[model samples]
Each structure stands twice: as C-alpha cells, then as structure tokens.
Target: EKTLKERFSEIYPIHAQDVRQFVKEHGKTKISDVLLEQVYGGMRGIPGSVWEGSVLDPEDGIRFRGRTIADIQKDLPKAKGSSQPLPEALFWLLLTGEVPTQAQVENLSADLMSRSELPSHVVQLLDNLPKDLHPMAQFSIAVTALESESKFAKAYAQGISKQDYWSYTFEDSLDLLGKLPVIAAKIYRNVFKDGKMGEVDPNADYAKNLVNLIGSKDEDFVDLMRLYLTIHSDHEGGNVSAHTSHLVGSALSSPYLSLASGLNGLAGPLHGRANQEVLEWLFALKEEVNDDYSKDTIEKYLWDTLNSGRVIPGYGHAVLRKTDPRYMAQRKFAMDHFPDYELFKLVSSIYEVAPGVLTEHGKTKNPWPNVDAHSGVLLQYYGLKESSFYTVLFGVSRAFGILAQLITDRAIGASIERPKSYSTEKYKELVKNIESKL
Candidate 1:
C-alpha cells in the first residue's frame, strides 16, 4: 500500500495544474462585490481567497471536502470497535478530497504515531511554564518553539526552487500535526494534572493516543475525542484561526510558525474560546436557578440576560442560518451516551428555549445554536471539566485544516495576502461624491 505522502505526491501536481488553469481562465472575472459596510465589518462574505479543504454555506453548515458532518460520519473510516470516524481519516480527506479506506487510515495513524515524539527542549519549555499562565498561552508558546524543527525554513534558507516549496512544507506540516497532541497533552498536564503525561501508543489511533496521553483510559471518552476532533477539524477558511494561518503561510512562513499564529487567534474570546464561555454561562444560569432547569425557568433567565444587554453566548452564528450540524452531532452523542445527565439535560432545555428567546429579542441574525452550544457540556460529562483548556482542544483540531490548506497554498503558489485599505476620510469623500452624483 502507498503511504499517505506518496498518495498526496501523486495527486498534488494534477490538482495544482487544475488550479493554475482555472486562475488563467478567470483571473479577472468579477466574482464578488465589496460593500462599504463589509470593508469596515470584518470583511464578512467577501470571497477573496482559495481554500481547498472545506466550504461553509449559510444554510448547510460546514462541508469538509464536499461532505457534510452527517455524510462524513457515514463515509469516513472508523477505528476498530468505535463508531465515530478517525481524525486521521478526516485529515486524509481534507488533504486529498477523497475518503480513505480503513487500511489507508490505519497506516496514516501509525505514521503520525511514529512521528509523535516531542524534542527534549520543547518538553523542557513546557515543563518550565507557570501553571497559571493559561493553557492556550502555553499551547501557542510551545508551538512557536517547535519552529526550531521546521524543515521548510531550512530548505528555503538553502535556496530551493519555488516548485519545491510544497514538498518541504508538506514535511513540516506532517511533523507539526504529529507533535500537536504531545504539546497539547503536556500543557494540559502541567496546568491541570500533575505535570506527568502518559506514553504514546504506537499501535493506537490518533484520538485514542490523545486520550491516552491526557490520562484517560475510558473507551467512550476516546470515542468522544474522535468525534470532537473530526468535526472541529475544519469549518471552511474565513474563520479567524484558518485565515490567520493561511495569511501567515502566504508569506512562506513555516507551518510551525503559521499555525502558532493561528493558535494565538484561536485563543481570543470571539473565536475558539466561545466554547469556554458557553460552559461558564450555563454554570451561572444553574447557580441562579438552583439546578432547576425547567423550560420556563430557563426562558425567564434567557430574557433577563437579553434584557440586560447581554447576548446569549451560544445561541447565534455569523454564517449558519440553521442549527449547526456540529451541534446536532454532539447532541446526538450526548443522547446516546448520557441522556439523563444533569448538564446534558440543562443544555437540552436551553436548546429548546434559547432560539425562541433570542428570536423574540430581535437582534440576532441567526438564532439557532452553533457548535459551541453543545461541546462544553459533552466534555464536562466525560470528566474533562476544565473549561479554560477547552480552546486548546479546538486549536489541536484546527491545525489539520490550517496545515492542509497551507500545503495547498504553497503548492499552488498563492501570493501574499494584501487587500487594499481606505481611510475613513476617503470613504466619507466617496460617499459625498456619490451623493452629489445622485
């Protein structure tokens, strides 16, 4: 059987040629119109770049390599005795746009395991960090420190041809992806547990190894890790972490540095940390109502928060018009495993009431629950209750998409991202000129 890298090498040139021809045919065609509001409003809905791994629809949610979450759950290869898809399989699909067979996915899993050892200095760095420095901070710092191992940087320094950039990038991407769980688990142990991590099992799947390193031996939690890592792997490319990594990689930065920058973006409250915020909001509501999670009590609490000018944490989305498919997937997981758990029951009640409350509040564009609405409670039920460390889990999964896209960016020779900007005065003058013409 061909290795994952060998398979990718076989397909990369053809894919690159396709991209080149497409650009040649339509490079100047006007596909999007930029509005003044979009210029100032975070560039939302502007189609300015190429992302190969996935696309998000306002109505359908995220599709990884053209497959929805439901489709992925059915199509991708799973671990031996677990029903959820393996994250390694998802990575293969993201990189190649084809669902891998069980043998191919197992080979990739073993390859990652063989490359999973952390360099001793990086381990020392993690060991020396302050316990209270925040898990996400440690995660970013550790990843940035891993830049010392970047093959792409060394190769570029030696004057490789532009055509060869993707090869070195592909190497560094695999190395970074392999070592991520090691770094993430070390941070978790140092911050929350006793600063001691378990050994990497070379025979295990990616999610199972991550669970093992994090000191969990439970099989169900391992399945949850598989599902969580797979679904959170990609959500198109416009989101903060994906865009940050792609933008950095466009400047030819190594995957380690690019992904480190992306991890820093993921640490922000509006992005990956939204999962943590959702859990905190639920805890606060539970405290207020004394664990009485009736629909009426939850509805009243939702209005109180809304009336007081606080937007409900996990009830809306910037893009998705329907309930997030990721949220539905996690809700199903909760239903299958812990249908009567208190936290899950509370989350379910909130789901029943939150959209109605937010819809009546009349401020949100999409009032359905996003992925953040359900992930935290599921993690809590499985004994991974440290909410602050939640975004680090997100960062680990996000690297799959970012690095996959980064390799494709180098392969296709994507240029440095430089969007034009205008000052407020220039916009005002343009508005005045348009009004005069009118």
Candidate 2:
C-alpha cells in the first residue's frame, strides 16, 4: 500500500458530481451578472459591498443579537466581529438550535485533519519559488503558480461537459489542499529558517506538523498552533476574505486562482492584518513604556493609545460586537501559560477600558475585543514574536476552508453567484442625471 504522500485525495461519488455542476455554472454565468450592481446600478443605502449584513438571512437574524455593539463598552462580548460572528456557539447553534457537543467537535476535527495533504505538483510550485522571496509574495505566487497547471482551465479547453467541470476541479482541489501546508512551510523556511525545509509528518496532524515545518517541534507550541487554526477557521459567508475567495471561485477559477485571490483580501489591515498590528502594538507599547507595564504610569500610556486615534489592534471589529470566543480561547491559553507578562496585563486593561471609551465616543457599539485584540499577548506568551507574518500563518490555516469550500462549491453546482440590486428612489435620481447628460 502506498503511504499517503504530502497530498492525496479520492472524492466521494456524490461530491464529485456536485462539484462538477457548481464549476460548470461558475464560469458559465453572464459577465453582466458580475457587473449587476456596478453596471446597472445598485441598492441606494446598501452599496454593492456588505450585502449579507443587510440581507436577512433568517438563520443569522435569529442569533445576530441586534444590541451587538449597543453599549460598546459592555455589549461587544456577544459577537466576535460584526461580520465574524461566533458562528459556532452563537449563530450556528441558534440557527441549528443546539450547541455542538464534544463528539461533534472531535469528529469535525478528525474529518478535517484526515484531508490535509499537499499534492506532488503543488509541492513543485513551492520549490519553484525563490528561496529569498518574502513569505506573502511567495505564498501568493505559489497558489497562483498552480494556475499554470490549472486542471479546470485545461478541462474547459478539452471540451469537458458542463456537468463534469467540477470533477477535474475537485481532483485538483484535493491535490492542492494536501499541499498547502507544505507550500506555507516552504515559504516560512525560505523567509526565516534558512531553507532547511521539513517534510510533512503523517503522525504530526494538521496544526502540529505545520509548525514542525516552520523550524519548531515543541509540543506546546504545536498545540497553540492547533488552537489557532481550530478557532479562526471561518467567520460567516460575507467576510471579505472568505467572500472574495468564494466570489472568485464562482468564476470557476481553480483552487490556485480563487485561493490566491482570497489571500489578497486577507492581506488587508482592516481584515486579517489585525493580528500583526496587535503584536506590533504591544511591542511598541512595551518598548516605549520601558516594559514596566505593571507601573501605574504604563496604564496611562495604554489608556492614551485609545485617544491617539489608533483602535486597539484586536479590540474593534465590524461584525463581532461581542468578546470573540476566539479571543477567549487565546485568553485561556494565556492564563494557563504566561499569566504574569506585563503586556498581557496591558491588553487586559485595555480590554477593560477601551470598550467603555468607544461606547461613549460613537453610536457604533462594536467595541468588544476581537480575535485580533488578544492575539499579540497570546503570541508573545507563546514566544512567537513575528508580527508581520501572522497573516501568512492565517493564510495557510485559511486555505484549508477556502479550498474545501471551493471543492464543495464545485461539487454542489453553485450558480454564478450573481446577486442583484436596484438603486433607491434617490440614487435613481443620480443615475437619471447621467442618462440625461448622455
């Protein structure tokens, strides 16, 4: 029997068919649909962006917690981000009508882990990247480089039937899925570990061995990574990062094309870059305040950070208006390990003070500390201090869901994803002016 390589996959029969249909329509949808709102115009108050926020998903409305950011200081603990609601405990449960039990969580974990492998061709792409390239640049290119070998585009050229489009795409997705960790690890090694790459350990599991490839093998560190990957997995359908990936994939783009497109969105500061900025924020505070964070004087400096006009790195989010459970997860990690660090103290204090100030300042109550808010402290406690690379780690972790969903989308025969809109009576007035001018 062949030992599973870095990546290998055999799709289920149903999934194979489902994926084929989705991709068949992904590229088949009209270009005018892509331009539905932009070309023909869009809803007035609701822009082309952020449709899910206003579009009533009855399921989401059930647990959306309207007072999400009401008190700002106090009400933020319900959702993690305005967009990234704690779908697991809060939204998913509310919609499904029950909390996931230990068994469910364990089964899901095992199911996801069972699938984490890198294909041989995908590995070749990682190796093709220059050893000295920036990790994000290398990461971005590694995914897109797979484009050069795009199975979907090739199938399209080969006259694949509409129903079979996702079949090849599914196979390619699995191939890419198994290899993302390898690519991410190679990128990490290229940037920081002097090109001493580690092989994927079949015994190591998904999150554990990912760090193993990053030049570390400490079990606790691996556990932290597991927790990190486990928690930040998905944040509803409309997150810029997740939505962008799905949006691009709707074009029947390959895993490489769609995944890389998603990474570009995740690279934004207003979105996934919060973790890096959080760590950087802590370092800056610690260095400027002489690391004596316990001092009364240091408290004032942290308080001053709020007034300085910089939102605390992880404290604010557009979707989750409540204390992010992900933050709570990391906080638990900190309590178990580095409970004495001054930076953690600073973070806790800010968590206490910042929300109150934000509540007073604006009607937007999204003042709760988010996943990014507590990230710096947790990362510092873990002895991993590379702020700039947090999102890269996130990309590797995120690729699992994105590619999985993309494969699933193809299997499901999802439509062109061409949502539509109409201008408000007032915005209609604006368009009328343009037409008249023409």
Who wins the TM-score comparison? 1
How would you encode candidate 2's per-residue C-alpha lDDT over 171-287 as one tens digit per residue? Answer: 566556545666777776666657677655554445655677776766667667766664555444556777888899888888888888888888887777777776777778778
Model 1, range 224-289, lDDT digits (tens) per residue?
A: 999999989987788889999999989999998899899999998888888888888889888999
- The stretch of ten residues in a row with the least summed lDDT in candidate 2 is 76-85
- Each model's Cα RMSD: 2.0, 9.0
Candidate 2, residue 308: Cα displacement in angstroms equals: 4.2
Which portions of model 1 show Cα errors greater than 4 Å? 360-363, 422-438
Clashing pairs in 1: none
How far residue 317's Cα lies from its native spot in candidate 2, in Å, is 3.5
- Against the hidden true structure, what lDDT does model 2 obtain? 0.59
Q: lDDT per model, in order?
A: 0.88, 0.59
User: What's each prediction's TM-score?
Assistant: 0.94, 0.68
